[PDB]
Amino acid sequence: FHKIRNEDLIFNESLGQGTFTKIFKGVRREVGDYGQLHETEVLLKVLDKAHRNYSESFFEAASMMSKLSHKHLVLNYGVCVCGDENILVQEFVKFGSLDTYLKKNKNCINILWKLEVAKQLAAAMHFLEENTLIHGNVCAKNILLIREEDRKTGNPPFIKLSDPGISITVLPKDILQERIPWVPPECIENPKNLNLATDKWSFGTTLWEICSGGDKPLSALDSQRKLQFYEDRHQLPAPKAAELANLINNCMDYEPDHRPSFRAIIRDLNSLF
Template identity: 30%
Template sequence: MTTKPKKFFDSLIKPFLGGRGKEGKAEEDLEAIAATEQKVFRYEKLVAATRNFSPKQKLGEGGFGPVFRGRLEDGREVAVKQLGRGSRQGAKEFQNEAMLLSRVQHKNVVNLYGYCAHGDDKLLVYEFVQHESLDKLLFSKEGSQCRKTELAWNQRYQVILGVARGLLYLHEDAHTTIIHRDIKASNILLDDRWVPKIADFGMARLFPEDETHVNTRVAGTNGYMAPEYVMHGRLSTKADVFSFGVVVLELVSGRKNSSFNLLPNPDVDSLLEWAWKLYKKGQTLDMIDPAIVSTADPEQVKMCVQVGLLCTQSDPKLRLDMKRVVIILSKKPTVLEEPTRPGIPGSRYRRRSHGMQGSGHSGGESSSGSISATASASTAALTASTSTTLTTPRHASQQERRSLQR
């Protein structure tokens, strides 16, 4: 399966990197990894595996390019991401994903088998994940009642725990801290045993060990991004924690945060606001997805809502870290601190610790998503509904700030 790793990575990465420095070191590291772990695939093997990239094998297409289902000679089923020619953003995501996932190995993170470069064709080869992405099962409007019942409460709870374990690995146990930056339902895949796998690392970032946060351009999906990240470009592991908290509340309610206008209460602006108001009234169980009422464990539901709210606090210092989340979910429920009002980008709220208002969002839009067994509109596959990926400058514009103060 291997072939001239040095030559391969020269053609794969050099067009994407302007200089050597840290990026050059990353390139050399990746070449060494490829040489020792035999991650380079021959183009002919992938052509055969995907039946010459047959339209019948196509799983979907997003900003990155098309994704094809295939079977290798050794019997492994794979999902092959093909870089769309002329896609500058896709090229950056391709390089980023290849480098970050080279040494990542965890049952709750999608497994990258290898890479391939052939002329203008650049491909990433992943394990094939049997079931659809979480958003397709959770938010599908076609036959929604039937599809939602596939994810009974116990399965949803295991998804919450699995994603938490995957994030804990990325934040604390990987070779270096990795911040995903785009944790959402469409980037969580479910295998044949309904085990969740975090996917799509095109926007992920390595995090310096000696830093509390980094300032960066904002890239993520509307409804999942932390306020301090949207407003000021302050990125830390707590940005992933915030996104995780949103996913937890979505799994409990069966409602998508970015579709808050569909909520039954016209006085709330988002799923987070709705969950917060019900929690304060002692009516947490009112937000349970009707499809799982018969299977839900009331105490677990209450705990998950409280965890979700603690993960989406306005002040990142008040949010749980993923180690504590895993401990809470893995053991008998313990006494948790009381959450304050969650941080809700795009609406008015006051950060208690900073005495300042929250953030809005702006910027260009594109699709982002994951590989799955069926089409999902995303970077790796098409989703059932449109998700908005935002890329904004480090600081919000004056117009955004004025709109928040009104």
């Protein structure tokens, strides 16, 4: 990881919170190409001091995204570990998380937009699968919109997948249960069951999000009822825009070995026209 000096980073507005983290917009003063000075917008993720013990895992997640380079993976600029703070310095994606964007723009997003975003996410996951790299936290909040659809010039939307944050393999059980139904059943049974099939399940849940205008599946269920939801082997209801319901249910297979490869998922996606 490239170590960035605290002097070169300026914290600005809070954008929200992750698990044991606070997230801010910031500015990084840097020497760019040809020696030109730039003040670059950045995303600053800060681990809560009270959870400093997760630091390793906190950085491990980010490490996963920087091992490979891909057009659909958010860039990591480096880390600031100056002092007692642990800071991730990442690319600032203009339009932010996809779930917020869907909730705000639901009244003007059709099937073609959803299908393009789904294809891009599936392509990112196919890249990860071919590299045998587990993401571990696919969800609409971790999809970021680089640019919007422009029907005037035919441009499709473009998305990037963000880093997964602290791994579910080390998170407390109640956080895992709160993350049903993104966390697959076998990881609720044993968090060390984290596997490639995990991301296929979570991809199904994320498709449900994309199709549901930013609604959160099973949000009306508390943790005990989410557990019970997995115990009775229920599936998510089809979204009112049901064009992807079969794909969602095929990915959210209670048998991890039966979840389809992302190549087959991409084939299915392309078959809808």
